[PDB]
């Protein structure tokens, strides 16, 4: 699964 802390600017619905 994606690492949500790779880029904090990435925040999909």
């Amino acid at each position, epitope marked *: *699964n*994606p*690492d949500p*802390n*790779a*880029n*904090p*600017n*990435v*925040d*999909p*619905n």
Partner: antibody
Amino acid sequence: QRQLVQSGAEVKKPGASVKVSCKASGYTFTSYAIHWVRQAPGQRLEWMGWIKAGNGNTRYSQKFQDRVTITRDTSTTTAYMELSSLRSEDTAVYYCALLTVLTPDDAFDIWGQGTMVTVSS
Amino acid sequence: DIVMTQSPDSLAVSLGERATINCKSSQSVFYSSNNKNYLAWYQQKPGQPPNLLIYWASTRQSGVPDRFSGSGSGTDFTLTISSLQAEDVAVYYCHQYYSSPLTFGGGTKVEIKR
């Protein structure tokens, strides 16, 4: 209009440190993370780290974690990257960037103009 | 490191011709939960920073000319320029934001024959 404006090109001796500034304007500074990315001659773009401009938390690449410090000053909406123990091989263009802001309210991607840093005796 | 590999390294077509750039990720950047691919395409010209063209693999950024389109899923991605214009000569890069560190491909240099 959303912008990032970087400090001017610099030259430093081997073993010295450099500090590049990144002045943000035209958006809510504290909402987003500023990344630092370097581009060395004929080399692929290298992500160095990010800072959350709000709380100041950072994440650094393994390649740079012992030598890089990313900081921010909310009062001046400016972020900074300091690279210490400079190698002549750290000669590169250093960018700050709001990489892929992809949220329910915003979809943008903004880069500073780049700061060339040469490490030379 | 999710390694991003681009093919070809350089291409040259005449004005108005279709241009195709391939990008392969060493690990799948697909997330089944939201059906998204964590991939972007950038254009860079000399002396300028890269400029974002496509994100989520296939969503063209508003204001980007619609001759630019992205496709693919998992580990195989394609940037298409349907009709290459003179201003499109540049190096094009794929980019993944699935895992840390963020990485970029080696670039494909797109050139005009005239």
